[PDB]
Structures are given as C-alpha cells and as structure tokens.
Design a protein around this ligand. Structure first.
Ligand SMILES: Nc1ncnc2c1ncn2[C@@H]1O[C@H](COP(=O)(O)OP(=O)(O)OP(=O)(O)O)[C@@H](O)[C@H]1O
Ligand SMILES: Nc1ncnc2c1ncn2[C@@H]1O[C@H](COP(=O)(O)OP(=O)(O)OP(=O)(O)O)[C@@H](O)[C@H]1O
Ligand SMILES: *[C@@H]1O[C@H](CO)[C@@H](O)[C@H](O)[C@H]1NC(C)=O
Ligand SMILES: *[C@@H]1O[C@H](CO)[C@@H](O)[C@H](O)[C@H]1NC(C)=O
Ligand SMILES: [Mg+2]
Ligand SMILES: [Mg+2]
Length: 1566
C-alpha cells in the first residue's frame, strides 16, 4: 500500500515542477505540429478536378505486326529464333510463324537456352532478334510430335524498341494513382504488349499450333471469325494529384515530429542522475521501479496529447470529403501513433543508460534516433524482393517498423478503402504478404526488448554514482598504537570499518585517497572526524552511503556489509552532503513535506512536524520561497532540516554548519545534542570549538590514514603542554618586543605562529607559578607595545590539530596587452577539445557517417538484374470473375460460350453471363464495387457476329500490367479446345531476354532524386555538427566564469574573436574529410574539372554564417545540455522542413509552382536552407550542362523545351548559386555586428539610528584618494511582494584599509558585491570604484560560489589571469610560484580543477583574485571550507597585500579573522548598517572589559555559587550544559582558578578581555 501512496507523491512532484514553467511546456507541446501542418496546408493548396463522365476506348487488331517492323534495322533484317533446334516440329511451327508474319525475317536455332543467353549477352551481331520461341519439352530424337498440352516462352527485347523493362516482377503497379493507368493510348501502356508485337507473335504461334494439329478444319475456322482486343471502360473519378507527391517522405515527416521528445527524454533522464539527485532520493528511500513509472507517465501524457492533435489534423475534412488520409477510421491511426509513442519512449530510456554526462547524452541520443532510421534507405528500393522473414527481421528497429507502417498507410490510401480495423490480417495486393497488424505487433515487441536492456544496464553498469551488482544477479532468489584510546565495552557499535580503501585513476600512477582505515562508531554518541583539506572525510562518507564502491575492504553499518546489501541500510539512513542537492522551483515547506513523506512518515501527523522543523531551523519568513533564491547560508539550513526530518537510526552529516552565523549554529548544536539518544551520528567539521563542545570521540586523518583517535581529554593531555595565550597587536608593533619580555618573565615558551595579528604562545604546566607577574606586566603596559584584546586559556583544541599536522614592474599595455589577452583566451578554448575528446569525436564522426551511408545507398539502388519469368494465366490472381455476353442468337457463338463456361470452371474461375450490354454492366460494377473491382475482374469476352462472321472481343483490365496476354491466351485456349480434344491446352510465359554487356553502359540521366538525397543527408549532418558551438559558451556563463573574466578586464573583441577563430579551425576538419569521401565515391559534380575548391567554398561559407548565430542564440539558455536539444530543432525547422516543403511544391504534376517563388524568396534569410539549395542546384547544373554539350543530337533537344542550364555556375539566374552565396556571406557580418552591439550594452538604452552610522551618510554627502565611494545605494527585488535587500548603504573606503562588512545570514552582503561589480542592476543609487563611476560606465573578485573551468588545471587557471592583467611573459613563473606556494597548493598544482576538494577550490578562487596586484579587491567569504592551517596562510597573504597600500573589502562570518586583519568593522542587518568604527571602538563601547567561559544540573548549580559569590554583578548568558558564559562587569581572576578546580569539577576555562562575538550577539534581538 505504501507503493501506491508514494507513486502519487512522485506524480505530484512532477506536476508541481511542470506547473511553474508553462511557456516552455506550451512551446514544446506544439513543435510536433509544425511538421504535420505542412501537409494540412499543402492539402488546401492542391486541388482536384472531378472528371464527370466515363471513359471509353476503341478496339485494335492483332492480325499483323505494327507499322514499324516493316523497315529493317540499319544493317540487316529482323531475326527470329527457336530454342529446341534438334526437333523437326519446333522448326515446322516456326516456319509457319515466319510465313504468317509477312516481312523479311531469318530463323536460327540453338542447342539450349544457355547458348541463346550467351549469344545475346556475348556477341555483337545480335540485338536484332525480335523474339525467341522456347518449347519446354524433352523431344527425343527429332521425330517426336508436339503433344496436345504445349507450353512455351517468348523472349522479347529488354528495352522499349518502338518509338524500365517488362515489369515481370509484379502483377500490379506498386503505388497506383486514381484514374486509368495510361489515360491516353487506348492500346495498353508501359510494357506495351501491342507496340512490341507480343500479342501478334503470340497469336501467330497459337494459330500455328492448330494448323499443325488439324491443318484443314483450322483454315475453315479462321475464315469466319476474327479476334480483336479492346479495353475496359473506366467509370467517373476525381483526379487529385496529392498522394502521389507526398509518398516518398511521409515516413520522414512522421519521424521528424517525435524527434524532439526523443532527444528531450534522453537528457532529462541523464542530467538528474549526473546531478546526484537520483542517488540522493534513493538514499532517503525510493524504489527504482517507481521512478521509471513516474517518468513514463510524465512523458506519455505529452505524446498522448500530440498523437491526438495529429490524428485530428489528419482526418478533418478541410473541404467537402477531401481530407488528408481521406478515409482511414481515425481510431486506428490513433492506435498506430500511440504504439509508436510507447516505443520511442522506451528507446530513449534504453539509450539514456549508456551515458553519465548530459552533454554527451544530448549529443549522442539525438543522433542514435536518426541512426536507427538509416537502414530504411536500403529497404525502400528493394522492398519487392524481400521475404516475410527478412521483413520481420528488419522490424526489430522501431524507426524502420514505423516507416514500413507509414508506407502501408499510403499504399492502402491511394487504392480505395484504406485502414479499417478489419484488414489487420489481409495484405494490400496478391503479391506481398505483409499485413498491418504485423507492424503493431513488432512495435509492441520492441518496447519489451528495449526494456530488458535498460533493466540490465541500469543494474550491472550503473555509471559513476551507483554501486554495481554481479553479472548473474537474477539467478539468486534473494534479489526478488599509543595515540589510540582504549575502546569502551559499554556501548553498541553502529558502524564497523575494517581495512577500507579507495584508489583513484589520476594520470598513470594510481594515487590513493583513503588507505587501510580501521574504526568503530558507537550508538548513542557523536563522533567527529577532523583533518585538513584533501584527506578522506568525504571519500569515507561517500563510501558508507553507497555513492561509489570501495576498491577493497568492507564495512558493516548494522551487520549489513555495505558492499553486499545496501538496500536494507538505506531504510534508516539520513544524510546531508557537502554541497546541497535541492530542487529549484520548489519551495521550502514543499521540500520538507516531500522528504518527510518519502521516508515513511504518516500523512496524519506530518504538518505539525513540518511546522516544528521550520521553527527550529530558523527558516520562517522564507517559507514558500523558491530554493533558487534563498541566500547561501539558508541552503545549509534547509539541507540540515531535510536530513533530520522524520528521524533516522544513522545520521551522517558532512560539514553541516558551514556558512551560518553563530545565532543559528547554537540552535543546530542544541538539536544535535537533543537527538543522539538512540542513534549514531558522524560529523566532519572545520570549527575546532564545535569538535570539543559536542564530541565524544575524535579522529584525525593526515593523508588518507588515521592519525589519532580518542576522547577530547585524552587528546589534550597528550599533545599540548599546559595552557594557551593569544594576543592582537596594533599597526606599529614589533614581535620581538613582546617576545623578549615574555622570555624574561616566562622562560620556557615557544611562539606558534604570527598569522597576521595573532602571535600566539604555548606554556607548560611546570611554570604555572610565573603567570601572575607576566599577566600584570602586560596588563599595565598594553599601550606601550600595542596589544589590543589579549586573552588566555588552557590548551585549546585548535593546537592539538596543529601539533598532529606538524608531527607528520611595468605591466603590459597597448598592443602587447591585446596580443596577450587574445592568446590566453585562444588557449582557454582550445584546451577544451583536448580534455573532452568525446565532443570532438562527435564533431568529426557524426557528420561523416551520415554522408558515407547516403552515398552508399545511392550506388546500391542503381542496378537492374534479370526480369524473372511470369506465367501468363488466370490463377496467378486468385479466384477472379469473368463476365461474358453472346448477343445475336447465332450459331458458333453459344457452342463457344459453353466451352468457355466449362474450361474456366476446370481452371477454378467463375463465369457470369450478363445478357444486357456488357459495357454498361462493367461501368456500373466498377463504380459500385470500388477499389476491390480491380482485383477480381481482369478479363472478359463478348461473342458477337457481323454479317455471317463472328467477332470475339477480348477485354483486358489495364490497371494490371500483363492483362492483354492473359485475355488473348484465354481466348486461344477455348479456340484450340473447340476443334480438338478436351484435353488440349496452351500455357504461355514471358521471361524476357537478358541485358547485354555493351548496352548496359548508357547511363545518361542521373539527376532524379540523386541530388536531393545528398542535399538532405548533408542537412541532417550539419544540423548536429552546428549545435556543438554553443556548449562551452553556455557552460561558461551558467557557472559565471565569464563575469569574473570580464571583471578582470578582458576586451570584448579579444573574448569573441579568438572563440570564433578556433571554431572555424574546428569546423574546417570535417569540411576537409568530406572531400576525401566525395573522391572515394567518385561523385563527379564535386570531384571534376575544378569543383573541389568550389565545394569547400560552400561548406566554409556556411560555417562562417552559422557560427556567429549559435553565439547569439545561446543567450536564452541557462544549461549547456538543454541548449543543444533546442538549437538542434531550430536547425531542423529552418533547414529540412522548408527544403522538403519547397521541393514538393515545385513538382509539375501539382499546379502550384509560382508560389514556390515567393516562398523561396522568403527562405533566403535562413542559413540552413541556403546550403541545401546551393548543393542541390550545383548538382543539377552540372548534369544539365554535361548533357546539352555531349552531342548536337541533344543540344537541339535542350532548347526544344528550354532545359535552361548555366555556364558560370555562379550566376544569379535559377540553376546557379549566386544569391545563396551572397545571402550566406551577408549573414555572418550582420550577425557579428549584432553580437558586438549587444555585448557592449548599446541595445540597453534602446528614524533615530546610531550616530556613528549617521555621520558617514553626511561626511561623504557634504575625494581623489579614495578607491571606492558608495552613497545612497539601494536594491529591491520585485516578486509581487517587494523585498528590500539594501537600504541606502552609504560609506567610503580609503587606501591601505580593510573594511569588515559583517552581518547575519541573508542580510545584504553578496547582493551588495553584485551591484558593486556589475552582476545586478542598480535602483536609486550611485557608487564609484577607482574614481570612475559605475552607474554609467583594476579590481579583483573572489565570488561566494566557485566559478572555475573544470577542464583546466590549477596552474593554467592562474596563468590565464596572469596574462589578463599585464605581467610580461618573462616575469610570470615567479608570479605563479609565489601564489601557489604562499597558499599551500603545490601538491595540487596541475590536477585538472574538476577533481579538487571542497576547500582546494576556495584556495584557488582566492589566489585568482590576488595575482597581478590589482588596486581594489573584493573578497566574499574567502575562507569557509578551509582548515586552520590554510585559513592562517590566507590571513598572511591578505595582510601582506594590504600593507602595500591596497583597498580591501572582505565579507566573512568567523570572528578571529575579523579581529586579526580588519580595521573598520560594520555590522549590518536587514540591509542597512548598524555600527561602524574600529574594533576597539566597538569593544570599548560599554566597557566592562572582562569575560569568562567555563566547562564542566547539581554540579553546575554548585559551581555557579563560587563565581556568583566571587564575581558579583554577573550578566551570565548562553549556557550549553557546561558552557556558562560570563560577562564580568587580569592576574586577579586567573589566580583564582589555581585552586578552584578540585572542588568545582571543571576541566577547562578561558578568561579574556571582552569578546567581539558578544558585541555581535548584542544585535540579535532585532
Ligand atoms: N573524482 C575524483 N577523481 C580523482 N581524484 C579525486 C576525485 N575526488 C577526490 N579526489 C582526490 O582524492 C582526495 C580525497 O579528498 P576529499 O575530497 O575526500 O577531501 P575532503 O575532506 O572532502 O576535503 P574538504 O576538507 O575540503 O572537504 C583529494 O585529494 C582529491 O584530490
Ligand atoms: N535573485 C534573487 N531574487 C529574489 N530575491 C533574492 C535573490 N537573491 C537574494 N534574494 C533575497 O534577498 C536577500 C539578500 O540575500 P543576500 O544575497 O544578501 O544573502 P547573504 O547575506 O549573502 O547570505 P549569506 O551571507 O548567508 O551568504 C535574501 O534574504 C534573499 O531571500
Ligand atoms: C562486330 O560485328 C562485325 C560484323 O557484324 C564484325 O566484323 C566485328 O569483328 C565485330 N566486332 C568484333 C570486336 O569482333
Ligand atoms: C524419351 O522421352 C521420355 C519422356 O517421355 C524419357 O523418359 C526417355 O528417357 C526418352 N528416351 C531416352 C532414350 O532417353
Ligand atoms: Mg569534503
Ligand atoms: Mg552571501
């Protein structure tokens, strides 16, 4: 029941996410209609004729040869032959035949048929033979007589001889058009059969047989009757030349409308597992088959609306009874489209499981969809030769199975009835056995076949974020030291780690991340894991939670062996990652509700729980606000809320409180204290008071190995000595002054590190007596040496970490500046094709296999074979009916009709007397029966007499090919039977002659579709190649690595021209690899006289005109993968769709050619259309020029009909590419201009507060040496409820200073930096940096969130910014080493900044903002994920950069740096300042410069008595069950605690001058 209660949850989530992008949804829901509207518009344009009256034809006469064979061929006379030559009968028959055909002819003779075939194809005196009678009889010893039952062939020519062959491969034309097959020519048609004298010779031989058998009765017979042949009259019809036009590319219009959802599904499924959003929901509890179901139900509704709109505008009558698919029962069309939609969803699901990156999934799942359709180019021509097995074997691809259904829809449509639910098992004609149900069967078998592949790949090859399974997973039935403390035996071990390890694949050396871990974490207490930046701590936690498998070892979360069955562990797991994983466009209460329901919590008690969590975390006013906005410190709060909601037995937190203010860290600490009773908790943290306040056992990792493990006291009394003391010096101070005094008073002590203004000391316990003197000595003389805010404590935790770690120039400008900024960007872009070589592979191979498989299917479909033998008899068609009439009541007419009646019934046919004027009966039945009349009535007879002489008409249905011969054979059969015995028949066959070798080398015309196919398969390749030039340009702006580059001062021309130049170089390679292909296949129009350069010019000119456009179009998008799949469809609409429409709309048969001019003039502004038409015209012009020049015999024919070719190849006139070249050349310039006009913002114009805060608003309002000036600055975010983020924020900073700018979470800091730099827009304010105003018109920038290029390494990212700011090439190695070494990045100097750590990216992002020595510097939380050792080096760098006169404005949350390197603090809340002045000013506000902090109900209450009766006037606050904090109103308070510990029950204490954090907390209740 939970499964159905969770499927509804997933569906609700998908519906909510879709509801908030309606423009995108409506847009992509009506893209499939721009391909099916082409047809519904063409159907209004093209019109019918409706011929009203029937068509009649006159008879012929087959007594003699046509009036063309009386003239002998040039050179000799006509020649005749017979195959059995060793028999006298076979010669005496042919002699009679020769006499009958009264011309000059000569006979021959051969010993077999093989000799005749060779003489035809291996000689030159041949090719004058007329026919060749072949008798199929054994014929012993030249004395055998002709049997009663004779049969023979007639070998006629292979070419149309009487001014395509004989079509003996089929009985009906493949695709028939309405009206008579040959409207004129009342003598037959395409195979002729009367022009070539087939009927004449056949009748002569049929009479020769009778003259041989009787010779006396046959003369008396053939003196009173003659046989003549007529044609059926055709009924009235309508003309409508529509279906014939759109028949070859109906499948290409059905595929090209589902293509978009095909390449949307593939990347929408992959970029939500590349984003770690699938592993996250699986970790929190989610069945993997409830996700596929949600995806399927999401993507089936779209294709159900689209498949209904297509069915709607495939059946509605636009004009009375005219609609597309004029009669096809819309139900079955809809069923076909649904059966295609299911399959094209399953195919995308299967494809998406081969890729792990959304870019390659989008670039290779839109290509595989079309790649699956290519083998139809080899099936369409040779469809009449395949077998049913070979037709079902090629239906295993869904696109081919759709193509061979869209073919039958046309074939059934242009015949009669169409598609009707009662023909699912009956083929079209009597020649192919292929039903329509066999298409729907394979289209539904393919879905299952693809599902069985997506079920296996998703389980054995999970990619980069899953934990795999063995290759046989379906077989089993269960699928369906002395630094280390001594472990406690009073607890239960939750997690047990044993010899765990992990090795990565950097370079070729197998560097290790974790190595041989051993640990045990117990239930009911918190274990804190410490370490520096890059020593496990996330590889361990990502391996305990199943994000990727261990290299070796094992671990037992609850006895479950994480590598064996983690599906049981993930029932009670709950975690928060280092970088949050949230849904944009999904509010906060929605997030909490969804993730409480997912885990299992009941629906009754959910809302109160969500309210409790919203109150706890602190997100109250941010309720129902989208996660995309938030702040930066609220993201972590929401993540923690999600992690703790619904309860969990195992909590795994990875840096939870990183980026929050203190007032909320305390609340998080309190909750974690209250929720550790009966669960295990694992923490990784970088604040060293957190690891002491809330921690029962602590572990520290050096470089993948465990250093120490134990409680918080055993560790302190092993590494420190006795105590600690810290100081903060003033500007004019010297360390030796303090050091010598300390040595003279306290001998044994060692300075730790003077990291800025810290200058700390370490003292042992053996010198505890000499404390008061040294304390008073510095108490009295604070001002002399400049010590502000001194403090002392007892061996804090921050020192144990240090002990463990230690134990183991004139800048370029002018020309040389631009020549350097250009080279830097050129290398930045070029190093992107070296690191992701999959993209360059897709750029070089995709455009090539689409052309080498279209030139391969053009050579293949251009060959003829043999014209097999056909048996000309009724009975090849089935059970036909054969009407006849005998009007005239005369003898010899009924005694023939009775023979006709009996012979057919013996054959198996059905006669039908009419008695009533055969012609009108035929016309009426042909109009009432419909299209089924052509399959059951094919011959007829009428026995009429004219003046004592009988005339036998032999009608034939010309809708079939071989009807005349069949009719004449039926007549001659009964004629032979009349005068001989009833067992006497004649059987005739065609079997034409074979083609020779000399006559098979004519091949003059080749235009046909041979240029159209090349130009179409080039467009389908350049649609995919040309979309890859916007991937880097979008992914470099989504990360906001472009905003920092422009802040650092890159000229726009330098940014864009180098990108254009590298893209042109990258585009040149396929344009040079296409020439090799055109040479290999010997395509003449692009290989001959000088056209090799003219083709490359076309390709390079298209590459010049599309590349600037793919830069303009990239401004819409925010994602790199979701821009490929929309630019690809933009390149198809403006390409193939229009080219396909214009080619159809210029056929002579359809009477609309003039409109294809006013459309072709509009489509010139589209750069994809121009290339296709240019290639097509270049191909057509070469052929029409090579034909009107070969000989004068064709030169006059060319001007007979005005073939109209060009000699220039570049003229303006039609068959010359002048205007296409002009329009492609004038588009690149018009796009570069428009891009440079938009990149330079030229198309953009087209209350009693504190006194000190109020004084700054006047000192600047009532300045040449000030780098930065802010006055009356404001910012409002309008969201139907305006939110004021900045309120007048007036202030000014001078040189050599360090402004503080503190605040709470979400107050104003980042949104201030944005306006200062230029990211966001201004409203009612002004400011000046470096003097020059920013409201109208050398600074560094370290943004809050890392904006780095993942394909570059650490040192290259620094070299780029060294080049962007002068720094001559000579003096650059020193300037890079000084920044890598002085920031502790030497180990990671060149390691591809994509595999860096959480803090190893903050180090680099800070090092970028300081290299080059800029004037102003904007730091924005520079140190969040940095450990103490590196956080101290950051302070040294910031101080040494400020002592050299540079304005600096940091923005941080920790306080020990805000007092170690700051000079003018400012606490701002709700978007306005509340205090300014030096930190000493703030601290000496209300005096009482003494504080305390102890650490241990009854014990604390008793220990409060001592400090209450000893320190009256206490204002104590903020206790943490031991952390009672005292703000007393120096050697007189440290000496007190020299005996009050034995009877006070404490272990540590810190007494110091008043804390800055207390001043900060004083503003809390506001
Ligand atoms: N996908 C990866 N490919 C190659 N090496 C990696 C990959 N991920 C991490 N590493 C390396 O393995 C080591 C593991 O570091 P890890 O990220 O676990 O440290 P961390 O504790 O998360 O750092 P921080 O304290 O900043 O959070 C790092 O030195 C890192 O360089
Ligand atoms: N793009 C935006 N659209 C609408 N509102 C926003 C946007 N960005 C921030 N806000 C809102 O305006 C306020 C300003 O947030 P700001 O960026 O100053 O937070 P912050 O002080 O940088 O947080 P932290 O210092 O913890 O990172 C926030 O409370 C936030 O809710
Ligand atoms: C072609 O035929 C002629 C006579 O018809 C003959 O003289 C000539 O040799 C033949 N060609 C060849 C190559 O033998
Ligand atoms: C003569 O023809 C018959 C066929 O009727 C055949 O069986 C026989 O072999 C032939 N005679 C000889 C000598 O082969
Ligand atoms: Mg980490
Ligand atoms: Mg911020």
């Amino acid at each position: 029941m939970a499964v159905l209660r969770q499927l509804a949850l997933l569906l609700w989530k998908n519906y909510t996410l879709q509801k908030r992008k309606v423009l995108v949804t409506v847009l992509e829901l009506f893209l499939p209609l721009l391909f099916s509207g082409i047809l519904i518009w063409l159907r209004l344009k093209i019109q019918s004729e409706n011929v009203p009256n029937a068509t009649i034809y006159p008879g012929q006469s087959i007594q003699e040869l046509p009036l063309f064979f009386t003239f002998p061929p040039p050179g000799d006379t006509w020649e005749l032959a017979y195959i059995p030559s060793h028999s006298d009968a076979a010669k005496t028959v042919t002699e009679t035949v020769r006499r009958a055909l009264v011309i000059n002819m000569r006979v021959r003779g051969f010993p077999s048929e093989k000799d005749f075939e060779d003489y035809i194809r291996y000689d030159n005196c041949s090719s004058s033979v007329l026919a060749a009678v072949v008798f199929e009889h054994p014929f012993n010893h030249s004395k055998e007589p002709l049997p009663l039952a004779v049969k023979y062939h007639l070998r006629f020519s292979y070419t149309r001889r009487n001014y395509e062959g004989w079509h003996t491969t089929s009985l009906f034309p493949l695709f028939p058009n309405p009206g008579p097959r040959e409207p004129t020519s009342p003598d037959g048609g395409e195979p002729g059969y009367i022009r070539e004298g087939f009927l004449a010779v056949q009748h002569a031989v049929d009479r020769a047989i009778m003259e041989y058998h009787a010779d006396a009765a046959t003369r008396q017979l053939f003196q009173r009757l003659t046989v003549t042949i007529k044609r059926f009259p055709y009924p009235p019809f309508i003309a409508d030349p529509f279906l014939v036009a759109i028949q070859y590319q109906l499948p290409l219009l059905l595929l090209l409308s589902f293509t978009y959802t095909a390449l949307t599904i593939a990347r929408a499924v992959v970029q939500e597992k590349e984003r770690r959003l699938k592993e996250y929901m699986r970790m929190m509890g989610l069945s993997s088959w409830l996700h596929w179901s949600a995806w399927f139900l999401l993507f089936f509704l779209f294709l159900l609306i689209a498949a209904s709109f297509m069915t709607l505008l495939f059946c509605v009558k636009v004009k009375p009874n005219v609609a597309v698919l004029s009669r096809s029962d819309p139900s079955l069309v809809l069923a076909f489209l649904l059966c295609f939609a299911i399959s094209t969803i399953s195919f995308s699901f299967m494809v998406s499981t081969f890729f792990s990156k959304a870019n390659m999934a989008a670039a290779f799942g839109g290509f595989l969809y079309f790649f699956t359709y290519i083998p139809y180019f080899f099936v369409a021509p040779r469809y009449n030769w395949m077998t049913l097995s070979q037709k079902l074997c090629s239906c295993l691809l869904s696109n081919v199975a759709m193509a061979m259904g869209a073919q039958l829809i046309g074939k059934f449509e242009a015949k009669g009835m169409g598609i009707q639910w009662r023909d699912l098992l009956s083929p079209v004609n009597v020649d192919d056995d292929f039903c329509f149900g066999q298409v729907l069967g394979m289209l539904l078998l393919d879905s299952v076949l693809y599902g069985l592949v997506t079920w296996y790949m998703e389980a054995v090859f999970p990619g980069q974020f899953g934990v795999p399974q063995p290759w046989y997973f379906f077989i089993m039935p269960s699928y369906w030291n002395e630094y280390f403390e001594a472990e406690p035996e009073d607890l239960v071990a939750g997690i047990k780690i044993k010899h765990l390890s992990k090795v990565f694949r950097v370079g070729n050396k197998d560097r290790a991340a974790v190595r041989d871990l051993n640990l045990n974490l117990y239930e009911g207490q918190i274990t804190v894991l410490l370490g520096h930046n890059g020593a496990g701590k996330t590889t361990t936690l990502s391996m305990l939670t199943g994000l990727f498998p261990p290299t070796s070892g094992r671990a037992y979360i609850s006895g479950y062996e994480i590598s064996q069955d983690m599906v049981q562990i993930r029932k009670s797991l709950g975690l928060c990652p280092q970088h949050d994983i949230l849904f944009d466009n999904l509010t906060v209460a929605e997030h909490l509700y969804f993730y409480a329901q997912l885990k299992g919590l009941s629906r009754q008690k959910c809302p109160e729980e969500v309210k409790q969590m919203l109150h706890i975390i602190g997100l109250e006013d941010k309720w129902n606000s989208r996660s995309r906005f938030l702040s930066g410190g609220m993201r972590r709060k929401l993540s923690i809320g999600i992690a703790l909601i619904a309860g969990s037995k195992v909590l795994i937190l990875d840096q939870p409180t990183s980026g929050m203010d203190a007032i909320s860290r305390r609340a998080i600490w309190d909750l974690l204290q209250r929720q550790k009773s009966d669960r295990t908790i694992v923490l990784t943290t970088h604040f060293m008071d957190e690891a002491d306040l809330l921690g029962d056992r602590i572990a520290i990792m050096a470089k993948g190995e465990l250093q120490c493990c134990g409680s918080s006291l055993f560790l302190k009394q092993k590494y420190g000595a006795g105590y600690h003391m810290t100081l903060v010096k003033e500007p004019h101070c010297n360390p030796e002054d303090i050091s010598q005094l300390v040595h003279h008073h306290v001998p044994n002590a060692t300075l730790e590190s003077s990291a800025g203004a810290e200058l700390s000391f370490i003292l042992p316990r053996e010198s505890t007596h000499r404390f008061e003197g040294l304390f008073a000595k510095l108490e009295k003389k604070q001002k002399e040496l400049g010590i502000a805010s001194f403090g002392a404590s007892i061996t804090t935790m921050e020192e144990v970490f240090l002990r463990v770690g230690k134990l183991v120039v004139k800048l370029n400008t002018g020309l040389a500046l631009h020549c350097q900024q250009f080279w830097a960007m050129f290398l930045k872009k070029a190093a992107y094709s070296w690191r992701e070589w999959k993209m360059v592979a897709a750029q070089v191979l995709v455009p090539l296999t689409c052309v080498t498989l279209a030139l391969l299917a053009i050579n293949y479909s251009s060959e003829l074979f043999d014209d097999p033998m056909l048996r000309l008899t009724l009975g090849e068609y089935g059970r036909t009916v054969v009407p006849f009439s005998v009007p005239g009541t005369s003898q010899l007419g009924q005694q023939l009709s009775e023979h006709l009646k009996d012979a057919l019934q013996a054959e198996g046919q059905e006669p039908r007397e009419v008695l009533g004027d055969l012609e009108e009966f035929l016309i009426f039945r042909a109009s009432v029966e419909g299209g089924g009349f052509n399959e059951r009535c094919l011959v007829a007879a009428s026995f009429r007499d004219v003046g004592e002489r009988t005339v036998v008409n032999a009608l034939f249905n010309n809708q079939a090919y071989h009807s005349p011969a069949t009719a004449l054979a039926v007549v001659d059969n009964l004629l032979f039977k009349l005068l001989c015995g009833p067992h006497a028949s004649i059987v005739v066959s065609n079997f034409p002659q074979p083609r020779s070798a000399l006559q098979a080398a004519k091949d003059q015309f080749n235009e046909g579709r041979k240029g159209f196919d090349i130009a179409l398969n080039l467009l389908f390749a350049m649609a995919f190649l040309a979309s890859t030039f916007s991937i880097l340009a979008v992914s470099e702006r989504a990360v906001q690595a472009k905003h920092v580059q422009f802040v650092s001062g890159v000229h726009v021309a330098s940014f864009w021209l180098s990108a254009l130049l590298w893209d042109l170089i990258s585009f040149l390679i396929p344009s040079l690899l296409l020439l090799v292909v055109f040479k290999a296949f010997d395509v003449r129009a692009f290989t001959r006289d000088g056209h090799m350069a003219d083709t490359l010019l076309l390709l390079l000119l298209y590459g010049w005109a599309i590349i600037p456009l793919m830069y303009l179009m990239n401004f819409f998008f925010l994602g790199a993968a979701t821009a490929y799949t929309r630019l690809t469809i933009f390149n198809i609409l403006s390409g193939i769709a229009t080219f396909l429409m214009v080619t159809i709309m210029r056929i002579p048969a359809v009477k609309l050619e003039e409109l294809s001019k006013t459309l072709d003039h509009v489509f010139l502004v589209l750069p994809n259309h121009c290339l296709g038409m240019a290639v097509s015209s270049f191909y057509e012009n070469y052929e029409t020029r090579r034909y009107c020049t070969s000989s004068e015999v064709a030169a006059h024919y060319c001007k007979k009909y005005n073939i109209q070719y060009q000699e220039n190849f570049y003229a303006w006139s039609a068959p010359g590419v002048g205007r296409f070249v002009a329009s492609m050349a004038a588009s690149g310039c018009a796009y570069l201009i428009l891009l440079f006009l938009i990149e330079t913002n030229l198309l953009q114009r087209l209350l009693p507060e504190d006194q000190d805060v109020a004084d700054e608003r006047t000192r600047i309002l009532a300045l040449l040496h000030t780098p930065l000036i802010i006055k009356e600055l404001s910012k409002v975010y309008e969201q139907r409820v305006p939110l004021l983020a900045v309120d007048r924020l007036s202030l000014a900073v001078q040189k050599g200073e360090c402004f503080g700018l503190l605040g709470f979470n979400g107050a104003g800091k980042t949104t201030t930096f944005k306006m200062l730099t230029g990211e966001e827009s201004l409203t009612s304010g002004d400011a000046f940096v470096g003097g020059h105003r920013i409201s109208s018109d050398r600074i560094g920038y370290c943004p809050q969130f890392d904006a780095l290029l993942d394909h570059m390494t650490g040192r290259e990212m620094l070299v780029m910014y060294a080049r962007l700011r002068g720094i001559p090439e000579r003096h650059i190695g020193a300037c890079v080493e000084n920044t890598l070494r002085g920031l502790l990045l030497e180990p990671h100097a060149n390691k591809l900044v994509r595999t860096y750590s959480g803090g190893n990216k903050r180090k680099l992002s800070t090092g970028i903002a300081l290299i080059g020595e800029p004037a102003v510097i904007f730091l924005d939380q520079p140190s969040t994920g940095m450990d103490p050792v590196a956080r101290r080096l950051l302070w040294d760098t910031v101080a040494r950069a400020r002592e050299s006169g540079k304005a600096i404005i940091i923005t941080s949350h920790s306080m020990e740096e805000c007092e170690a390197l700051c000079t003018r603090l400012a606490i701002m809340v709700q978007g306005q300042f509340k205090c300014l002045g030096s930190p000493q000013h703030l601290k000496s506000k209300f005096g009482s410069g003494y504080s305390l902090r102890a650490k241990v109900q009854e014990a604390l209450e008793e220990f409060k008595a001592f400090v209450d009766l000893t320190f009256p006037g206490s204002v104590l606050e903020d206790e943490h069950q031991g952390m009672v904090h005292y703000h007393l109103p120096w050697a007189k308070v440290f000496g007190i605690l020299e005996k009050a510990k034995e009877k006070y029950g404490v272990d540590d204490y810190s007494v110091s001058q008043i804390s800055l954090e207390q001043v900060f907390l004083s503003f809390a209740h506001l």
